[PDB]
């Protein structure tokens, strides 16, 4: 509630920079992360049969087409 921010702004910004670097330096790597996300999306597409839901939406939309 004081809002000093004279040098505390630079101190908190340097602390946020170092903490964000130390936190994000243990999660993932952008050199193999594309291949990892592609493998993850492929196994997710195998595990979720939402293409059957897309054919289902087509089959439930074709019933209201009136054959004009």
């Amino acid at each position: 509630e004081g809002t000093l921010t004279d040098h505390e702004r630079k101190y908190l910004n340097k602390l946020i920079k170092r903490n964000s670097q130390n936190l994000r330096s243990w999660d993932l790597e952008e050199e193999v992360r594309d291949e990892l996300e592609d493998i993850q999306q492929s196994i997710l597409k195998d595990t979720v049969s939402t293409a059957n839901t897309d054919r289902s939406k087509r089959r439930r939309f074709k019933r209201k087409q009136f054959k004009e």
């Binding site: 439930r60 019933r63 209201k64 009136f66 054959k67 004009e68």
Partner: protein
Amino acid sequence: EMVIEGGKDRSIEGLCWSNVNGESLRLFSIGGSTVVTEWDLATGLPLRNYDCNSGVIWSISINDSQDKLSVGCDNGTVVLIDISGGPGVLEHDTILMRQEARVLTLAWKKDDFVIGGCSDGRIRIWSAQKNDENMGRLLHTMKVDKAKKESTLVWSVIYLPRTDQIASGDSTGSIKFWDFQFATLNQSFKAHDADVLCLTTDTDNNYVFSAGVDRKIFQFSQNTNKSQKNNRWVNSSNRLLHGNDIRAICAYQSKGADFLVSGGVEKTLVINSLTSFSNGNYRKMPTVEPYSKNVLVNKEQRLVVSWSESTVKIWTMGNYKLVCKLTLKDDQNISTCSLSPDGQVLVVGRPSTTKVFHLQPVGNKLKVTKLDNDLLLRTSTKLVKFIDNSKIVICSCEDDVFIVDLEQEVELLEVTS
């Protein structure tokens, strides 16, 4: 006695009455999206916009003794709403058994069974009956014939109580009479040459009158002893007294009157009789009967204001000269419009949000400028008739009169019941 007008982005493609005996009426309309709108009768401005849970509503029917309301949506669903108390109060209690064709028209036998013509060329019947272990489910599915290379759609379905029948008209014209129990066809008539859209009857089902987009209203009769023993209907009479189409008919009987009324995509309205459809007279009404105004004139600068819905158009008298127009879409629907004496301030109305414009004659045309009084902008407005040029008389939908527009209250007395 009342016009409840709406602006753009809306239609009433179906409405229903409800009068439990001894209490107020309530009529219910169908917006083009999945809402039912229960309008009031205290002022003519809606007290509910209920959202039935499913689809997009096509048509609603009333239960017998007006207790429930069958609501036929687009995805296949038919939703049932209960009325427990009358005005404003609405609970739904069941969604019925779901199919894949779009529902088009519903009707009730009694408080027991609902009948729905769908969009596959089939007429379903569901059992909507409490105190019974078989509700929310369809009992039978009767099928109407298709075309050779065209999918047909049964539009209209009604019930026949005494001769225990249902009459179904479709997009081939084939008015087919099915029997209620045994779920079977009884008769067929391919006399209509277009898409049937509507049909009604009388009290003990001596007749049934149908119409659709062949602009022909025609009759079927069941009056004589042979017809009521064999349960037989004859294509008795036929009659074309229309211009383009029919999209609605209904009929009424009393001991003081016996007449039906029809209207279509043509804006006219016709009145025939039931017991003398071929025999008796024929009554056309005019296309407009302006208890609701749309035109005022004013003597100064010799000009005339004509307001459409959400719109106004002003022009002078020469020959003639077109002056100006205002499509104030921020005013969503219109009401009374009036221009002051000496041609200075005009009021465009709306039953909660009216506006006023100073119109300055700048020669060949009129320059418009807004002016924004807040009390004027949020009061409920029905009529303005302009004593002076500065002040403005305000009618209210709460039975009051105000005086505004120079920077208050005119009280009117009590009402019996």
